[PDB]
Design a protein around this nucleic acid. Sequence first.
RNA 1: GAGGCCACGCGCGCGUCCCCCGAAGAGGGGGACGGCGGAGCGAGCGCACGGGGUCGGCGGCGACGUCGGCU
Length: 48
Amino acid sequence: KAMSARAEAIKALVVSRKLDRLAYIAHPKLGKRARARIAKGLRLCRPK
RNA sequence: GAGGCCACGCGCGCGUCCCCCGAAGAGGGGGACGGCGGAGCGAGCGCACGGGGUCGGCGGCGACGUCGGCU
């Protein structure tokens, strides 16, 4: 009974920062898409 | 408005901030930043204070007198 009472009580629901940005890009997983963006920037050149 | 530095450099759209007119301080027109968004790839020569020396540098001397042998 104590386990059930506890279980039902628990289930009762209702800028830039350059140095921070570079550490984010250097992350192997968090910065994967970020450093892919800058790679395409190095290659492609487009007007406008 | 008659210099110095930057390990700052593609677009499109999204966001954040700043600017304009603002004809509801609506609605569009512009700048800056972004760590945001589903879609592949740079190669080709070199120089080196770069994961422990190499020269694609050279000279002299050599048989009955001398050459080498730290034992």
